[PDB]
């Protein structure tokens, strides 16, 4: 199912949805995969998250050009870390409109990230204010509350079985929540569960650092987080 294109991998998850994967070789630690989404919505493409770098993100745009050959209307990035926002200059250079959580844009400079052009805001229930996310088509953006970071956001694809937890969700076989450095350990469990409740029909859970999984990834992540609080 995987298609390789330079140093990147693309996996088709639905007729109009692909997972993009980029790698960062870290000496000793080895290659670290980060996943995002590419969505074909009629006559345009929507991207969720950049690659680790500008160069890798340019290759995502080249692949879309080659395999889909539609313009990229917009990209949404799911928090102010390198794996999700490392490639913002490459999207900008391409004249792609970028959206992030207002708080992601606010944290970006301290994190060494370039801010998105536009800020998303959320209701108290976690759902994006539609006026901040115009023409998002099937992208349903949900802020589940603090977990991996204070700014972490999530994306469901309307009319598919796919919801994207980004770095908030770990796979159902994960031994731990990984590094708990920039994390809200108190609210993590509830944030995991809010993601679950926001996209109840999603049977395929896509995440940053594991292969697509079942809803068991949400319940496992929440149950690991329970043992922190």
């Amino acid at each position: 199912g995987d298609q390789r294109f330079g140093d990147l991998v693309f996996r088709q998850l639905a007729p109009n949805v692909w997972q993009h994967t980029s790698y960062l070789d870290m000496p000793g630690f080895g290659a670290v995969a980060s996943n995002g989404l590419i969505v074909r919505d009629g006559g345009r493409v929507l991207v969720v998250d950049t690659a680790w770098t500008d160069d890798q993100t340019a290759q995502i745009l080249n692949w879309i050009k080659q395999e889909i050959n539609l313009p990229v209307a917009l990209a949404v990035v799911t928090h102010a870390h390198q794996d999700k926002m490392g490639g913002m200059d490459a999207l900008h250079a391409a004249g792609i409109a970028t959206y992030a959580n207002a708080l992601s844009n606010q944290l970006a400079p301290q994190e060494g990230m370039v801010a998105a052009q536009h800020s998303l805001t959320f209701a108290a229930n976690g759902w994006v204010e539609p006026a901040t996310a115009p023409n998002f088509g099937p992208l349903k953006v949900f802020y589940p509350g603090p977990g991996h970071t204070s700014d972490n956001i999530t994306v469901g694809i309307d009319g598919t079985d796919i919801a994207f937890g980004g770095c908030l969700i770990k796979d159902s076989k994960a031994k731990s929540l990984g590094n708990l450095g920039d994390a809200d350990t108190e609210h993590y469990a509830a944030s995991a569960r809010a993601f679950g409740a926001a996209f109840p029909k999603a049977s395929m859970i896509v995440m940053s650092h594991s292969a697509p999984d079942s809803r068991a990834a949400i319940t496992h992540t929440a149950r690991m987080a329970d043992k922190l609080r």
Binding site: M26, V32, W52, Q82, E111, C167
Partner: peptide
């Protein structure tokens, strides 16, 4: 370095 899961 803030390389996602890798804290350096």
């Amino acid at each position: 370095x803030x390389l996602x899961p890798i804290p350096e």
